[PDB]
RNA sequence: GCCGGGGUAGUCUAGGGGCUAGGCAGCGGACUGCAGAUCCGCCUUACGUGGGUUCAAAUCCCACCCCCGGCUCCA
């Protein structure tokens, strides 16, 4: 990669200043771990995760003077659960066609009560609960995908991972983000 | 590349310096082509050369972290 | 305190950068770069390099001594509290800044206006005129605590032949303060050249460094009652509040003042810039006040056809300002379609013309 | 090519210092250190003056009320510093030539501020000297007696709610229900105490606060704030005659750029951390139980009520005038070890706060100083 | 810019943390050509955008954008 094959293109502010910011953010280590700033296992996970993120928002910003990159790896054939649909769009934004549905919540409801607040809400949820695993079914159903995935991006959504493939196989993280 | 992965090492404080300062320094064109940022092909060399050096820093500063 | 704290989480929207800033006041007042990493270096905090600068500053302004203000309008006050006399008078011009007024006020000092030469269209001030308010005030028995002078103004952007006002001054035994607020750190100036006892200048508005700091400039003859000391703290002095200057804003000045000693020698680049951005309004109807041509970047029009379309366009007098907004245009005043007052100082050249074609397209896009 | 008359790339030693590579101990410093919230907000304004449009949104009005509510006081003005505060009610309320009646201990800016609004001061003092140097806060009303009864008046009150020398905290309401009863005004300074504990105008019956920014509110200097009753409203906000709107003691200001705006940013961090100030005296008093141990003597009221400590250090004297460096050696010694914030030459008395540290860098600190006067004879 | 109304799928209108809104000159298919009922999917990622809160947001919080009304001629 070199900067003369760069090519005429718009700088995306918007990414100039996430990228910015993050090692803004990734400053205070240079304070708070002062004046050696040696870092243990996960001092250097959090830290190196603001430099990653920066990396990528610089590499979206080269993107747009020619310069190409990869785009991570996703399988478009295989169904993704998810809880957030912050998770959701960002997937079907990332990649349209490619398949995804969103639960809504944690999906079991002792699995709810795993997390908290009695209870009748919860036989209240009745319908939610498995309107989740109904709807899971009428995409699994027709598509019927080889394997299925479940994106975890905290520890809650690995619970949710548990009880998806009770029923039916696979798991994922971070790796298509 | 993970985060996840990232071992227990030192930050290197005038890498990371460098690393911020050509950020600064790449900043003036979000002043100077306001407000429709767009760039010519001189300016466009001239603004990525700093954005590239950049991540060239920033992964010497992984590198002290078990990146390579 | 049942008070929601989210509103001060994202101050992260300044739009400085998305839009071109036309407004006077912030023009000179743009970072540069060097300065930008000082700031990284000195978030919190850190005088010998203050002391060189100041040192630097008085021949930067050919003057014999110099401190650091919180601005301009701290730096009139300071000399009107420290040299004149409760009840004393202050002589200062009609284009006079409104802080100039209120720090005589709180120095409980009196003021006098010294008159136009002209005022429709061009607005000068008739700096003879300071021989005759002076005379006509000493007459009537009222003593002169202090000259003052605007360079230039903040309203028309006129530029002054300080030199009159200092031999004036000069002969009739009054101090002299030049207001170089909008003066110093655009244009080259020389204090002594001007006769002038006092300077003041803002840092944030023309010296290219963040709000608020200034820098006040006098002779070796006024330095004693403007450095005087603490009788309990004699190293502390009254004036400055102990003042141990401290802090970004006295770092981005120090920073910025290689760039701005440089661009005082390209001044006539941005009357260039300036010039061409008067010429060129003027063939869709607008009309330059003050004095002609510009010998200073703050141009104030007269704008009759920004006013005509407003009267048929829905969005009444804001139509302009929406307009600019949507080129990515800002710094004007909203709804105000009679005057508008601009400076493309500091600007590219590719921006200065980006200015004008917008506003061209508005007017007839718009009628 | 440099435009030569004088010297301009001595200039460009600014870029780079070592602001990241030492822990600054320094007490006035502490409360001073910018969150991330703020040094985004800098990047976002560092130019110039950052007026949209003294009512503003940039939410300026909406900070005010709420940091009117924080200090429960009826109002609030920004300014450029706990000085610029003081000098102002000390102008528009006093008259020329009324005495303000303050503590010994109050910081130099109390006096100088008085000085300059052409004010006479006298000084209430200890209720004992070494080594808590605690002040006599019922010593106000016979100093007040004092001045009246030889005919002078006292316009304003003054407390230093903590002193910038020893740290000891006030019991402002006795002050406030003194001046109350004696109808005297009352200003507290809360420099040093506004952003670092929580604070109440109206329990202490203060008439008048001063805030520190940059001392005690994480924001840049210099920046301040004035906290106010409506009853002087209409003195400090008295406005000019030719401009109805400006007001004078601001010198009609738009409180300007950068400092206030970092004043809003650290403003939510501010608040959370008054809450979590008994953490700080925890790293506080750690310090001083473990500095003793090794011959520090801990001046002023027992315990640290504040995180301001000031050591008595013989043993630093007794290697001082031993080792080449003379007095140097203990600041070079924990500059040798990334820190700093202590003045050079001084081994009888030393300043440091660890406010705001993490407790690894307290624990750090500690050891490099015992390190230093064992490894030192 | 300020004060109000608003933005929900090709557009029409509800809902104010979780009950998978529902009606068409919109288009294919469920014998053929004319006319009306169902199954559907359909552009499907429905909630203007980016953040935040939550296990879960059209829904609550912050900021910003656009459409409709209105109001202002310097400090």
Same mark, same amino acid.
């Given at each position: 990669?070199s900067?003369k094959?760069?090519?005429?293109?718009?700088?995306?502010?918007?990414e100039?200043?996430?990228?910015?910011?993050?090692?803004?953010?990734?400053?205070?280590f240079?304070?708070?771990?002062?004046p050696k700033?040696?870092?243990?296992?996960?001092?250097?996970?959090?830290?190196?995760?603001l430099?990653?993120?920066?990396?990528?928002?610089?590499?979206?910003?080269?993107?747009?003077?020619?310069?190409?990159?990869?785009?991570?790896?996703?399988?478009?054939?295989?169904?993704?659960?998810?809880?957030?649909?912050?998770?959701?769009?960002?997937?079907?934004?990332?990649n349209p066609n490619?398949?995804?549905?969103?639960?809504?919540? #944690?999906?079991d409801?002792?699995?709810?009560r795993?997390?908290?607040?009695?209870?009748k809400?919860?036989?209240?949820?009745?319908?939610?609960?498995?309107?989740?695993?109904?709807?899971?079914?009428?995409?699994?159903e027709?598509?019927?995908?080889?394997?299925?995935?479940?994106?975890?991006?905290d520890?809650?959504?690995?619970?949710?991972?548990?009880?998806?493939?009770?029923?039916?196989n696979?798991?994922k993280?971070?790796?298509?983000? | 590349?993970?985060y996840?992965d990232?071992?227990?090492?030192?930050?290197?404080?005038?890498?990371?310096?460098?690393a911020?300062?050509?950020?600064?320094?790449?900043?003036?064109?979000?002043?100077?082509?306001?407000?429709?940022?767009?760039?010519?092909?001189e300016?466009?060399?001239?603004?990525?050369?700093?954005?590239?050096?950049?991540?060239?820093?920033?992964? $010497?500063?992984?590198?002290?972290?078990?990146?390579? | 305190?049942?008070?929601?704290?989210?509103?001060?989480?994202?101050?992260?929207?300044?739009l400085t950068?998305?839009?071109?800033?036309?407004?006077?006041?912030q023009?000179?007042?743009?970072?540069?770069?060097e300065?930008?990493?000082?700031?990284?270096?000195?978030?919190?905090?850190?005088c010998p390099?203050?002391?060189?600068?100041?040192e630097?500053?008085?021949?930067?302004?050919?003057?014999?001594?110099?401190?650091?203000?919180?601005?301009?309008?701290?730096?009139?006050f300071?000399? #009107?509290?420290?040299?004149?006399?409760?009840?004393?008078?202050?002589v200062?011009?009609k284009?006079?800044?409104?802080?100039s007024?209120?720090?005589?006020?709180?120095a409980?000092?009196?003021?006098?206006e010294?008159?136009?030469?002209?005022?429709?269209?061009?607005?000068?001030?008739?700096?003879?005129?300071?021989?005759?308010?002076?005379?006509?005030l000493?007459?009537?028995?009222?003593?002169?605590?202090?000259?003052?002078?605007?360079?230039?103004?903040?309203?028309?952007?006129?530029?002054?032949?300080?030199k009159?006002?200092?031999?004036?001054?000069?002969?009739?035994?009054?101090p002299?303060?030049?207001?170089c607020?909008?003066?110093?750190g655009?244009?080259?100036?020389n204090?002594?050249?001007?006769?002038?006892?006092?300077?003041?200048?803002?840092?944030?508005?023309?010296?290219?460094?963040?709000?608020?700091?200034?820098?006040?400039?006098?002779?070796?003859?006024?330095?004693?009652?403007?450095?005087?000391?603490?009788?309990?703290?004699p190293?502390?002095?009254?004036?400055?509040?102990?003042?141990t200057?401290?802090?970004?804003?006295?770092?981005?000045? #120090?920073?910025?003042f290689?760039?701005?000693?440089?661009?005082?020698?390209?001044?006539?680049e941005?009357?260039?810039?300036?010039?061409?951005v008067?010429?060129?309004?003027?063939?869709?109807?607008?009309?330059?006040?003050?004095?002609?041509?510009?010998?200073?970047?703050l141009?104030?029009?007269?704008?009759?056809?920004?006013?005509?379309?407003?009267?048929?366009? $829905?969005?009444?007098?804001?139509?302009?300002?929406?307009?600019?907004?949507?080129?990515?245009?800002?710094?004007?005043?909203?709804?105000?379609?009679?005057?508008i007052? #601009?400076?493309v100082?500091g600007l590219?050249?590719?921006?200065?013309?980006?200015?004008?074609n917008?506003?061209?397209?508005?007017?007839?896009?718009?009628?």
């Amino acid at each position: 990669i070199s900067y003369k094959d760069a090519k005429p293109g718009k700088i995306d502010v918007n990414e100039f200043k996430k990228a910015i910011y993050l090692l803004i953010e990734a400053d205070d280590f240079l304070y708070k771990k002062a004046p050696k700033h040696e870092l243990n296992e996960e001092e250097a996970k959090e830290f190196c995760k603001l430099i990653i993120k920066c990396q990528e928002h610089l590499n979206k910003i080269l993107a747009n003077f020619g310069f190409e990159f990869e785009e991570k790896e996703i399988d478009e054939g295989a169904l993704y659960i998810v809880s957030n649909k912050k998770l959701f769009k960002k997937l079907k934004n990332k990649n349209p066609n490619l398949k995804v549905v969103c639960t809504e919540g #944690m999906l079991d409801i002792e699995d709810m009560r795993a997390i908290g607040v009695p209870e009748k809400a919860l036989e209240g949820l009745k319908k939610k609960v498995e309107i989740a695993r109904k709807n899971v079914e009428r995409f699994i159903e027709k598509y019927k995908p080889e394997k299925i995935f479940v994106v975890v991006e905290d520890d809650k959504d690995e619970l949710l991972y548990l009880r998806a493939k009770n029923l039916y196989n696979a798991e994922k993280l971070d790796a298509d983000e | 590349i993970s985060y996840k992965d990232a071992k227990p090492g030192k930050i290197d404080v005038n890498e990371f310096k460098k690393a911020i300062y050509l950020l600064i320094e790449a900043d003036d064109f979000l002043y100077k082509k306001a407000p429709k940022h767009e760039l010519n092909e001189e300016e466009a060399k001239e603004f990525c050369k700093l954005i590239i050096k950049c991540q060239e820093h920033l992964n $010497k500063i992984l590198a002290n972290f078990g990146f390579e | 305190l049942d008070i929601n704290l989210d509103k001060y989480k994202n101050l992260t929207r300044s739009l400085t950068r998305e839009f071109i800033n036309l407004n006077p006041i912030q023009r000179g007042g743009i970072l540069p770069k060097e300065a930008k990493k000082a700031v990284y270096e000195y978030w919190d905090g850190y005088c010998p390099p203050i002391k060189d600068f100041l040192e630097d500053i008085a021949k930067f302004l050919n003057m014999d001594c110099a401190r650091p203000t919180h601005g301009a309008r701290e730096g009139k006050f300071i000399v #009107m509290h420290a040299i004149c006399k409760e009840g004393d008078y202050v002589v200062l011009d009609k284009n006079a800044h409104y802080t100039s007024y209120v720090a005589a006020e709180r120095a409980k000092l009196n003021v006098a206006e010294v008159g136009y030469e002209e005022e429709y269209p061009t607005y000068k001030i008739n700096l003879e005129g300071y021989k005759e308010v002076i005379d006509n005030l000493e007459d009537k028995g009222k003593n002169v605590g202090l000259i003052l002078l605007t360079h230039v103004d903040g309203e028309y952007g006129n530029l002054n032949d300080a030199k009159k006002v200092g031999k004036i001054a000069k002969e009739k035994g009054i101090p002299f303060l030049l207001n170089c607020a909008y003066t110093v750190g655009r244009m080259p100036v020389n204090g002594k050249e001007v006769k002038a006892d006092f300077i003041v200048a803002s840092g944030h508005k023309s010296m290219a460094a963040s709000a608020p700091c200034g820098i006040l400039a006098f002779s070796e003859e006024f330095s004693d009652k403007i450095t005087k000391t603490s009788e309990k703290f004699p190293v502390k002095e009254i004036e400055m509040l102990g003042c141990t200057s401290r802090g970004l804003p006295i770092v981005t000045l #120090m920073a910025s003042f290689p760039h701005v000693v440089e661009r005082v020698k390209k001044w006539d680049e941005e009357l260039k810039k300036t010039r061409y951005v008067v010429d060129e309004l003027e063939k869709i109807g607008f009309k330059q006040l003050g004095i002609k041509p510009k010998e200073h970047d703050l141009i104030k029009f007269e704008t009759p056809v920004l006013d005509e379309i407003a009267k048929k366009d $829905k969005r009444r007098g804001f139509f302009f300002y929406d307009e600019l907004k949507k080129r990515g245009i800002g710094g004007i005043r909203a709804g105000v379609t009679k005057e508008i007052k #601009m400076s493309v100082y500091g600007l590219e050249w590719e921006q200065v013309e980006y200015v004008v074609n917008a506003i061209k397209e508005i007017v007839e896009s718009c009628k």
